[PDB]
Amino acid sequence: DSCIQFTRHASDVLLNLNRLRSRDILTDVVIVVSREQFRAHKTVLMACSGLFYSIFTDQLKCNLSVINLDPEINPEGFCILLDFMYTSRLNLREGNIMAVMATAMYLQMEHVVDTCRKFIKASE
Amino acid sequence: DSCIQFTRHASDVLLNLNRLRSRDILTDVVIVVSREQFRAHKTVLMACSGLFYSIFTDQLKCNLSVINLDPEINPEGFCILLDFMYTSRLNLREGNIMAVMATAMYLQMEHVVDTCRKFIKASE
Amino acid sequence: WVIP
Amino acid sequence: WVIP
Ligand SMILES: O=C1Cc2cc(Nc3nc(Cl)ncc3Br)ccc2N1
Ligand SMILES: O=C1Cc2cc(Nc3nc(Cl)ncc3Br)ccc2N1
Ligand SMILES: [Cl-]
Ligand SMILES: [Cl-]
Numbered sequence: 001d002s003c004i005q006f007t008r009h010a011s012d013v014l015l016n017l018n019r020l021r022s023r024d025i026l027t028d029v030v031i032v033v034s035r036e037q038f039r040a041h042k043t044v045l046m047a048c049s050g051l052f053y054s055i056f057t058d059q060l061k062c063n064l065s066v067i068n069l070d071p072e073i074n075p076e077g078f079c080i081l082l083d084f085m086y087t088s089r090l091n092l093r094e095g096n097i098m099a100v101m102a103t104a105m106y107l108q109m110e111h112v113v114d115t116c117r118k119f120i121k122a123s124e
Numbered sequence: 125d126s127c128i129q130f131t132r133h134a135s136d137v138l139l140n141l142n143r144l145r146s147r148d149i150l151t152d153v154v155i156v157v158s159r160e161q162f163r164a165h166k167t168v169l170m171a172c173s174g175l176f177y178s179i180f181t182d183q184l185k186c187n188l189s190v191i192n193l194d195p196e197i198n199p200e201g202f203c204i205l206l207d208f209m210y211t212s213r214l215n216l217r218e219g220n221i222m223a224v225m226a227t228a229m230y231l232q233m234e235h236v237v238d239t240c241r242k243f244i245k246a247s248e
Numbered sequence: 249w250v251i252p
Numbered sequence: 253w254v255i256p
Contacts, residue, residue, distance in 0.1 A: 001215060005252040006235055009212035010134035016171035025181060026167050041167055043150050047140035057149060088133035089256060091125060111130055115253050129256040213252060239249050 011088075017044055018086040031082075032068045036075035038082055048085040050108025070106065077103035084112065092119060135212075141168055142210040156192045158178075160199035176230025180202040194230065201227035208236065217242060233239055 020041070022025055027039040040061075045052035055061050069078065077099035084090045090112060092100060101116035144150055144165070151163040166186075169176035179185050193202065201223035208214045214236060216224060225240035 001213070002217070003213035003215050003252060004239065004249045005212050006208075006239075006249055007212075009208075009235075010138040011208075013138055013168070013171045014134040017167060020167060020170065026170070026186070041166060043141060043144060043165055044137070046144065046150070047137045062150070084130075084133075085137075088129050088131075089125070089127035090128050090130070090253075093126070111133075111253075112165070115128065115130075127256060128253045132253055214249075235249075 014086065015087065017041065021086055028065070030066050031078070032066060033073050033075040033078045034071060036078075038078065040082065040085075045084055048107075048109060050110075051106065053108075073103055073106060074099040081107060081109065081112065084109075090115070092116070094123075131182060138210065138212065141165065145210055153244070154190050155202070156190060157197050157202045158195060160202075162202065164206065164209075172231075172233060173180075174234075175230065177232075197225040197227055205231060205233065205236065206210040208233075209235055214239070216240070 013040050021039070021044075027041055029040055029042050029045070031038045031040060031045075036061055042052070044058050046056050047053075055067060061067075076096060080091050080096060081103050090100075094113070097119060098115055101113060101120070104112035104116060145163070145168075148163055151165055153166050153169070155162045155164060155166055156167075166176070166180050170180050171177075179191060185191075200220060204215050204220060204224050205227050214224075216239070221240055221243060225237060225244070228236035228240060
């Protein structure tokens with residue numbers, strides 16, 4: 001086509017989606033990870049995670065307001081990944097890399113899994 | 125912080141949100157523009173438009189499944205802007221620039237209004 | 249704004 | 253991935 005493109009549009013959209021999350025505006029699901037609860041937008045979760053994409057395209061699960069993750073999932077690892085989904089920034093540290101990679105594999109977040117594997121290979 | 129960032133994350137999120145729109149997945153509102161109807165995600169509309177941000181943060185309007193725009197609004201201008209919201213690409217043409225700018229002013233989409241004013245100033 |  |  002003969003379209004023009006606004007370079008910063010996608011970043012500005014995600015920044016605004018994160019502002020809505022911070023003020024709990026139009027969040028439509030709670031993700032339960034052991035004793036912790038995380039409110040989010042189903043569409044953002046689906047856009048970032050192969051697991052949430054499969055869950056919310058399911059004709060029965062699409063209508064659930066609460067999703068319980070596998071008990072092996074670490075709440076801090078999930079929190080770091082939820083922040084990444086809404087900001088593009090990943091708080092990857094020596095103390096959390098194993099939990100973050102295990103959570104990203106479960107959530108089917110391929111680019112996160114890839115950088116975790118590379119950071120782990122560098123330290124061996 | 126000591127975060128790393130994935131450059132393409134915001135673009136990939138928006139691409140996936142547009143795929144959901146194309147398959148009518150988790151769309152939660154219909155925007156009526158005269159005889160035309162456009163299905164969309166309230167969160168994406170709010171993230172792109174000052175008008176939709178004000179509408180869906182309203183305690184009564186946040187619960188509406190149908191929003192009727194002002195009858196002066198052109199359906200093609202709205203369609204071009206809805207596409208821009210979900211892709212960052214604006215199909216700006218000599219034949220549609222006036223309708224697109226008028227719609228972007230009504231929707232409170234400042235960057236679109238700015239490029240329209242510049243393209244119009246160049247042709248005078 | 250750019251030419252994509 | 254970059255250092256932002
Ligand atoms: O690593 C990742 C990230 C991700 C996101 C989605 N999300 C969607 N995929 C498609 Cl094709 N359409 C709409 C949506 Br929402 C699917 C798989 C994966 N795997
Ligand atoms: O030209 C524009 C585009 C736009 C988008 C929003 N959206 C939001 N703004 C804020 Cl501050 N927080 C959350 C959201 Br969603 C507000 C105003 C405007 N004006
Ligand atoms: Cl990813
Ligand atoms: Cl804009």
